[PDB]
Design a protein around this ligand. Structure first.
Ligand SMILES: [Zn+2]
Ligand SMILES: [Zn+2]
Ligand SMILES: [Zn+2]
Length: 122
């Protein structure tokens, strides 16, 4: 199924995201660690975050929201996860399922563009 490949790509980026948020080795050798650290340091200093119109915060929110549904830690390292878990425990309570029942709202190859074609000089 294409949903398994989609879940695998999203899980690649979610593991890279939680890794990047807990990575005390900052100038790390992992490829997606450095890609996630760029967008995490960006959004922490941003003023147009998803609610406004920022595409990098919105694209980071897509993977952080997919992550937060499954995450169960008291104080997880991901910046948006805590906020998303609080609103989801208030609204949904029971979280989300697996594979065929997941946050399938995005393309798995497009997540690889979100960290390559993001806002900057040209
Ligand atoms: Zn790292
Ligand atoms: Zn932003
Ligand atoms: Zn989390």
């Amino acid at each position: 199924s294409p949903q398994e490949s989609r879940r695998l790509s999203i899980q690649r980026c979610i593991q890279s995201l939680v890794h990047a948020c807990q990575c005390r080795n900052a100038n790390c050798s992992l490829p997606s660690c450095q890609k996630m650290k760029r967008v995490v340091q960006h959004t922490k200093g941003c003023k147009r975050k998803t609610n406004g119109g920022c595409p990098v915060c919105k694209q980071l929110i897509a993977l952080c929201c997919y992550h937060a549904k499954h995450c169960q830690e008291n104080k997880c390292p991901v910046p948006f996860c805590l906020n998303i878990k609080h609103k989801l425990r208030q609204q949904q309570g029971s979280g989300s399922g697996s594979q065929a029942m997941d946050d399938l709202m995005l393309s798995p190859d497009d997540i690889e563009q979100w960290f390559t074609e993001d806002p900057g000089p040209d």
